[PDB]
Amino acid sequence: GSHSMRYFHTSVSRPGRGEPRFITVGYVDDTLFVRFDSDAASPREEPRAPWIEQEGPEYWDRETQICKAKAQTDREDLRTLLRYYNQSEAGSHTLQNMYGCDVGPDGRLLRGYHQDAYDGKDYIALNEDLSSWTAADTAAQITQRKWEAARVAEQLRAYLEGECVEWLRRYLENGKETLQRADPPKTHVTHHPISDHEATLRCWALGFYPAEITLTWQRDGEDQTQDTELVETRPAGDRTFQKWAAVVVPSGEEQRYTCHVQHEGLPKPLTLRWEP
């Protein structure tokens, strides 16, 4: 189907406690595959998925150098942002960047991304045209002017349309056992008495990949959206995800309620009920 690659980067300054901490991770779809942390002893980019381990030493050397260069650029950029916002050197600040690409089932570029944030707020983003910029404020307009003069958008476009898509396709092939496998949720319904008058029905979805899923409760075929407690999808820690949805039901009315599960790994959407 369709797939994505993303690189995420965070630098956090810490005045009086050395240089900023820099952490970057790379994902294909919902799979972490590389990481770099500046606070490691002799930091290197490290593999986090089995299918990237086969890349040779030249790959790891280049990735590591890019990560060190990015940490250094961020250190300088953090100093610049103190000027742009008239801020003192005493506080901790955050610089984030994400970039990457989406591809369709035929492997062609669907959309590219490159966006930066300061202290948790949008700063400057490359537009979907991969040719113009959206600056959030008058400080980011200074950056925009510099990046227009330096033709940064053209450099990003060339990467996003070329290497980003080409390497994503390589990873999808080398990792086809996992990246191209959807694991359906294992599902079940549990029953939790509240009183002699009511009980909670909780519909569980466990062990699924990728994270996208839809869980809903119906009563007599009508959606219970306003009455459903739906937890945020959460990582199991083994590559897979979990989610549940719960409704409070009158005692004895449990068989009116059906849980409906949609996920890419299912042969067909599921309808489940509580089974005492």
Partner: peptide, 9 residues
């Protein structure tokens, strides 16, 4: 694989 960042804010 990554892209070199070659610009400053």
């Amino acid at each position: 694989r990554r892209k070199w960042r070659r610009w400053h804010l």
